[PDB]
Amino acid sequence: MNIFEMLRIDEGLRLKIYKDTEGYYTIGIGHLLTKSPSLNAAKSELDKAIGRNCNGVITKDEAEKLFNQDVDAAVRGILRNAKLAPVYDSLDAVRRCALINMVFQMGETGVAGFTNSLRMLQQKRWDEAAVNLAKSRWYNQTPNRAKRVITTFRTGTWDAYKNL
Numbered sequence: 665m666n667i668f669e670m671l672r673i674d675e676g677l678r679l680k681i682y683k684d685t686e687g688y689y690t691i692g693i694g695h696l697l698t699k700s701p702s703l704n705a706a707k708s709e710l711d712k713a714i715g716r717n718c719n720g721v722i723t724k725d726e727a728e729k730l731f732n733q734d735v736d737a738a739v740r741g742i743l744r745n746a747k748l749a750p751v752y753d754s755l756d757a758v759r760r761c762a763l764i765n766m767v768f769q770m771g772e773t774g775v776a777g778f779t780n781s782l783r784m785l786q787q788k789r790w791d792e793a794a795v796n797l798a799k800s801r802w803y804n805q806t807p808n809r810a811k812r813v814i815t816t817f818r819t820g821t822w823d824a825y826k827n828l
């Protein structure tokens with residue numbers, strides 16, 4: 665298991681523009697296009713991202729390319745972030761993926777707001793962090809996903825993803 669497989673399971677893959685759980689225009693493997701309620705804005709963002717006239721549809725290779733860009737961006741983003749980098753550096757490999765997962769979903773800003781959970785993770789207080797992590801909108805809005813990521817931080821294993 666690795667971060668790509670992990671996110672591929674959490675985000676799914678759709679080749680046509682679609683609305684994510686928040687009702688935002690998205691495509692491929694969780695690639696957010698825009699927060700605007702406008703589909704044209706979405707299609708425009710799509711063409712710009714891909715570099716051609718897509719009319720709201722992309723190929724699997726195009727999806728995978730965006731995905732490669734998005735994961736790189738997330739890691740790079742974490743590494744650049746004063747609040748996140750130290751946590752990331754403190755973690756083992758599997759748990760690093762769980763952190764990447766959150767940043768991919770909520771953005772570096774959002775995750776950086778989990779101050780308390782972050783301190784806990786840094787301190788390696790797995791159970792306590794897991795409880796804190798669950799007291800969030802994130803958990804209440806996307807519980808199955810949150811549970812998987814949380815279980816990952818708690819255990820340091822892929823068990824939450826094995827069998828999916």
Ligand SMILES: [Cl-]
Nearest residue numbers: 798799800801
């Ligand atoms: Cl809550």
Ligand SMILES: [Cl-]
Nearest residue numbers: 806807808809
């Ligand atoms: Cl969910």
